[PDB]
Design a protein around this ligand. Structure first.
Ligand SMILES: Cc1cc(C)cc(C(=O)N(CC(=O)NC2CCCCC2)Cc2ccc(C(=O)NO)cc2)c1
Ligand SMILES: [K+]
Ligand SMILES: [K+]
Ligand SMILES: [Zn+2]
Length: 356
């Protein structure tokens, strides 16, 4: 029923100059170990990992960007150090390119397994993350945009115009995913992210609510930016009820990809929010009502090892069919959260009749 892909070879990507960098190899092994402790692994169908090909990376990335990252596979440490400093917040090791290939190819196999009907949904415990990677550059711990590539891969084996919904609940804006699909009406990108008027990473006004897409893509980019607050379950539930789910139902996606960063969880040193594991489980179960249940959960950020292990395991439990948790929908929101939601409603009401 539920697929799961994990490969410890993705642990080889590491930071040679700061072993305490929070994007640790143990991120994925701790999540995998938690699935075993909770006896969820044996309930899933193990999907094998594989390398994405260079032709598949070219679905979203330029040949120059593919070539440069590929060239790092055999660089000396001094060259890996210099190459990394040419990007915003990037460390590179000799294994980084292969791990990025394995992360993308693992989601390709997961999407294919969903599209053949072999599994109903799937989880991908992969690293390095992807949603900060742009067409021509790496950024924010990301080399290739795994979620964006998986969307294009799905279209390449079913129908070119297959309607794919990408929900990005990582605490950071997926600037790479937004730009790749900004003019595309076949891929709806909805991102919830801490914004702080543009001061939170990645420090760009591209993440604001008035960025709704370009050309034919107008209305197919939904930014839900949080400002001046410590958001948690009530704010994310309200955004799904008023924004994500009404838009997603009207879009009627045929496939749902979740850029699932868990750095908005309580205790995360980079996020500062307090979304609980039950909150992530509620969001997952909501998305399962779409696309006849065809949901692929792809790991992005998340850096409290205990928090991400519990949170993603709760999402897998939901995909396996376990009963969703009960949450108080009457809890009052932070006042700035209501302002954020109303700003998004005003910006997207001219494009979605479900908001009018
Ligand atoms: C180079 C570096 C390393 C580490 C471990 C963290 C950070 C960091 O503090 N950052 C967020 C931030 O506010 N930087 C400001 C920008 C304005 C001027 C001064 C610092 C970067 C970052 C990138 C990606 C992700 C992610 O992918 N999360 O899922 C998280 C953090 C930098
Ligand atoms: K996000
Ligand atoms: K779009
Ligand atoms: Zn993040």
């Amino acid at each position: 029923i539920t697929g799961l892909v994990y490969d410890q070879r993705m642990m080889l990507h590491h930071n040679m100059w700061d072993s305490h960098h929070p994007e640790l190899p143990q991120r994925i092994s701790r999540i995998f170990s938690r699935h075993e402790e909770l006896r969820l692994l044996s309930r899933c169908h193990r999907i094998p990992a594989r390398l994405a090909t260079e032709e598949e990376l070219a679905l979203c990335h330029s040949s120059k960007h593919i070539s440069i990252i590929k060239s790092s596979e055999h660089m000396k440490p001094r060259d890996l150090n210099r190459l990394g400093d040419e990007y915003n917040s990037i460390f590179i090791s000799n294994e980084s390119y292969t791990c990025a290939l394995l992360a993308a190819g693992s989601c390709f196999n997961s999407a294919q397994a969903i599209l053949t009907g072999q599994v109903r949904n799937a989880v991908a415990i992969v690293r390095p993350p992807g949603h900060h990677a742009e067409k021509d550059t790496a950024c924010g711990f990301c080399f290739f945009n795994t979620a964006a590539l998986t969307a294009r891969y799905a279209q390449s084996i079913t129908r070119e115009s297959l309607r794919v919904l990408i929900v990005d609940w990582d605490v950071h804006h997926g600037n790479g995913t937004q730009h790749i699909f900004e003019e595309d009406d076949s891929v709806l990108y909805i991102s919830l992210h801490r914004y702080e008027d543009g001061a939170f990473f990645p420090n760009s006004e591209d993440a604001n609510y008035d960025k709704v897409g370009l050309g034919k893509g107008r209305g197919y980019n939904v930014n839900i930016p949080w400002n001046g607050g410590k958001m948690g379950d009530p704010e994310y539930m309200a955004a799904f009820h008023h924004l994500v789910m009404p838009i997603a139902r009207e879009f009627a996606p045929e496939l749902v990809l979740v850029s699932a960063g868990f750095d908005a969880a309580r205790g995360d040193p980079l996020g500062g929010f307090q979304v609980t594991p039950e909150g992530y489980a509620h969001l997952t179960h909501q998305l399962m009502s779409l696309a006849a249940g065809r949901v692929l959960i792809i790991l992005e950020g998340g850096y409290n090892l205990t928090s991400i292990s519990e949170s993603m395991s709760m999402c897998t439990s939901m995909l396996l069919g376990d009963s969703p948790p009960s949450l108080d929908h009457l809890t009052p929101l932070k006042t700035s959260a209501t302002v954020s939601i109303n700003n998004v409603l005003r910006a997207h009401a001219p494009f979605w009749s479900s908001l009018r």
